[PDB]
Design a protein around this ligand. Structure first.
Ligand SMILES: C[As](C)(=O)[O-]
Ligand SMILES: [Co+2]
Ligand SMILES: [Co+2]
Lengths: 406, 406
């Protein structure tokens, strides 16, 4: 049941496998190269036409009955984070291949052509800049990104150069709007929503909007013994209260996620009230108006907490990504796909960002989620079951088939 | 009186004066010598018998009317930390000298002899070991610290031989529980309590008792975007609430202070709900029982929160120290000193230990604090006003006077 797909996942999982069992494949390395060629051999087996674009993106084309028809794109990525799993990335790609090759084996024809794409560098690990391949196909790679360097200090442009890739030709990788019918990506959930409901497959409603705000809280460093409670300007105590406000305000909507996952304290002694505490709100929600409305509540409540406790709080916005709603054509297709196959229709937002987010400016997008065991992602523990991947490939298949009809 | 004290503080404040801004006066060095010879010189001018003990403490005796009577001790320290102010230490030693000399110049004799003392190495900067002098006199100088080594690697013992002080003749510095009637020290507050009250002076009640307890809070590391508020098990959020609780409970008594001044998050990512948080609670009160009561109250609420949030909290006592009170005899004396001069008496704990702690076994002890500008200390920003200093010294005068009566 979903053998070929599972066998390919296990096999690809060997490429850059660590002693941990996890994987590490950075862009523009021999390992991702080995991976790209391995996936490419699966693309040939499926009867696809194989090429790489100007951004290093790997593509398999299956012609439709109208060579001039607009393209249905299915992909995901091959690169990983450092000690990553072997499902985040390849599921989408390998299921993509699985979908077309099934079609060719059973002599199934489609009006539109279907391209399976493995995008260059979604996770962003090597140059700390993410989603290089998909921005490129979308035509929104900033030249600021070419100047990013890795640990060994080689720049993206330099890496690209070494790889045979003239950064000058990067615009050639772009697809113009209206050459693409749509884009669909099968991905593991990366959370426990689906495992908690007890279902293998969900439909993505969209990719949540995001904000990173850095909180800097300034007080007065002072010896603990010397400083009565009534006199203090304790910014760690201030931080603790704000972190609670964050939780209260994210819980309130039923829809939002809010997290403080990093927090530095200055100076950092056991017996010293801190001078400064810095931390970063990670705050997301599918409706931007809700996200910001949530942020306003945190801001207003923080402002008073500041004045009450005689400390200074400045915030800075580090990153903003607007939400991307999934399209009705893709969603309606995945729903039909499930009903046909006897799966319940389960809707859910994608908290994390994906290559799909970078394709919205140029075509309608959509996504399908596969149950994630214990929600684990980006580590060796990452696991989706063979049958669950099977479930997701059937749906993908029937979602792609629909979209590629006239 | 007032002016003579000030001129001396400055004269002395030049002795280890660093282009850095502060004072570096480490024990058994050329800079210490220059500083004792200097104060020794003021002492000789005061009309005192002057000597150094076998630990290098500097004594100026004003003979009492009963030469056999018990000795009233009056001191502080001449040495410093690396980039220190010129009031921490001197103020006491120079104010003490001011007292006796003012007495001599006026017609003043007291039943008990008075000795001004300058303790060698209270800050402990040279050897990781502090209160060498005061311990030596109290009889509690461990033979293990003869082994303690310099940054240049010289051993305490070798530094004393160098200064021509026989380490074997150390026990001779000691004095009986009988030998000494009382000990008083005038010190800068080293805190803002007097500043915010509006007062130049105050009477130290003791040092608080102290516990350090490590909390380790464990939940589940998961994707911050993909995990809904209603599924996560967030150790930071939990920790934040324990930290608030710490504050709520130290505030409740009026007398307790509780401090979190370091906080480690694991793994550390802006988009990762943490797996673990670790922080250390510094908790202090003058009455042990009353702090012990605050720890129970914290610990229980912590447990209650652990259970509610489904996370794991493990507490761990790192260190425990008892309070040490200042004796009523000295306290009554300072009390009387303030009433005589028209100063309201104001009580406060000292944040730090001083030479007087090391004196508690052998006699009644007490201290007087003077207002510190902005609480700042142990740096060159360290400042006390001429007026404030005079005020302290005048209070010290009549304190010493009352304690020297038969
Ligand atoms: C790039 As992500 C794992 O924060 O959506
Ligand atoms: Co991914
Ligand atoms: Co001192």
């Amino acid at each position: 049941q979903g053998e070929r797909l599972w066998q390919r996942l296990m096999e690809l999982g060997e490429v850059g496998k660590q002693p941990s069992g996890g994987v590490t494949r950075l862009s523009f390395t021999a390992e991702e190269r080995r991976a790209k060629d391995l996936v490419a051999s699966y693309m040939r087996e499926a009867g696809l036409f194989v090429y790489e674009d100007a951004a290093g993106n790997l593509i398999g084309r299956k012609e439709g009955t109208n060579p001039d028809a607009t393209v249905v794109l299915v992909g995901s990525h091959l690169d990983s984070v450092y000690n990553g799993g072997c499902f985040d990335g390849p599921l989408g790609v390998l299921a993509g291949v699985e979908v077309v090759q099934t079609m060719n084996e059973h002599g199934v024809v489609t009006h539109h052509p279907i391209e399976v794409v493995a995008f260059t560098d979604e996770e962003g690990a090597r140059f700390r800049f993410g989603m290089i391949g998909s921005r490129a196909m979308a035509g929104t790679l900033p030249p600021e990104a070419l100047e990013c360097r890795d640990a060994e200090g080689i720049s993206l442009a330099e890496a690209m150069k070494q790889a045979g890739l003239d950064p000058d030709r990067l615009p050639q990788a772009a697809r113009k709007p209206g050459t693409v019918k749509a884009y669909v990506e099968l991905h593991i959930e990366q959370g426990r929503v689906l495992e908690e409901t007890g279902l293998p497959v969900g439909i993505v409603t969209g990719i949540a909007g995001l904000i990173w705000v850095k909180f800097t809280i300034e007080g007065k460093a002072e010896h603990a013994g010397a400083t009565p409670m009534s006199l203090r300007r304790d910014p760690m105590a201030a931080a603790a209260q704000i972190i609670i406000v964050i939780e209260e305000e994210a819980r309130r909507t039923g829809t939002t996620v809010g997290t403080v996952g990093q927090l530095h304290v200055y100076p950092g002694g056991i017996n010293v009230i801190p001078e400064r505490v810095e931390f970063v709100l990670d705050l997301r929600d599918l409706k931007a108006e809700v996200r910001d409305q949530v942020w306003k509540a945190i801001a207003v409540r923080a402002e008073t907490i500041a004045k009450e406790r005689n400390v200074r709080v400045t915030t800075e916005r580090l990153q903003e990504m607007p939400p991307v709603l999934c399209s009705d054509e893709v969603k309606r297709a995945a729903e039909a796909a499930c009903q046909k196959l006897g799966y319940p229709s389960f809707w859910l937002p994608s908290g994390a960002a994906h290559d799909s987010v970078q394709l919205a400016p140029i075509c309608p997008i959509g996504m399908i989620f596969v149950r994630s065991q214990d929600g684990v992602s980006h580590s060796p523990a990452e696991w989706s079951t063979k049958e669950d991947c099977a479930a997701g490939a059937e749906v993908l298949y029937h979602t792609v088939w629909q979209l590629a009809q006239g």
